[PDB]
């Protein structure tokens, strides 16, 4: 669920998921689609491609089990659909952290800013 995703994002990036990524660029923001503005935004495109293909559970509301152990995310989920959700979320947390060096606050509030047509997953 968004609860596990939010916690993973804090653990890896040190940031608040809602305020720092909830409206960022053309892909991180919620409901946002379009060509990525930068590497951070590309992480979010990959993330949505990852979870939107899962048909058997809900990315937003279904909780799964994971641990922050030895300073790393481990997906410890039995349900195959929920394990794939966890792996999608783990991947975006890592990706956002690895691209913190180009995180740009100009994209932070981008809901009303125009985006190019999205590319294919």
Instruction: Please give the full DSSP string across 8-76, using - where no structure is assigned.
Output: HHHHHH-S-HHHHHTT-TTTTSTT--SS-SSHHHHHHHHHHHHHHT--SS-TTT----EEEETTEEEE-
> Among all residues, which ones are annotated catalytic?
47, 89
Angle at 25 between CA 18 and CA 47, to 5 degrees: 70
Q: What is the rounded CA–CA span in Å between residue 20 and residue 8?
A: 14
């Amino acid at each position: 669920s968004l609860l596990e995703l939010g916690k993973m994002i804090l653990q890896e990036t040190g940031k608040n998921a809602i305020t720092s990524y909830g409206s960022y660029g053309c892909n991180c923001g919620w409901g946002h689609r379009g060509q990525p503005k930068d590497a951070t935004d590309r992480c979010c495109f990959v993330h949505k491609c990852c979870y939107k293909k899962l048909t058997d559970c809900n990315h937003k509301t279904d909780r799964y089990s994971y641990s922050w152990k030895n300073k790393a995310i481990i997906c410890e989920e039995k349900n195959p659909c929920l394990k794939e959700m966890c792996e999608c979320d783990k991947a975006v947390a890592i990706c956002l952290r690895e691209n913190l060096d180009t995180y740009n606050k100009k994209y932070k509030a981008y809901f009303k800013f125009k985006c190019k047509k999205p590319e294919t997953c």
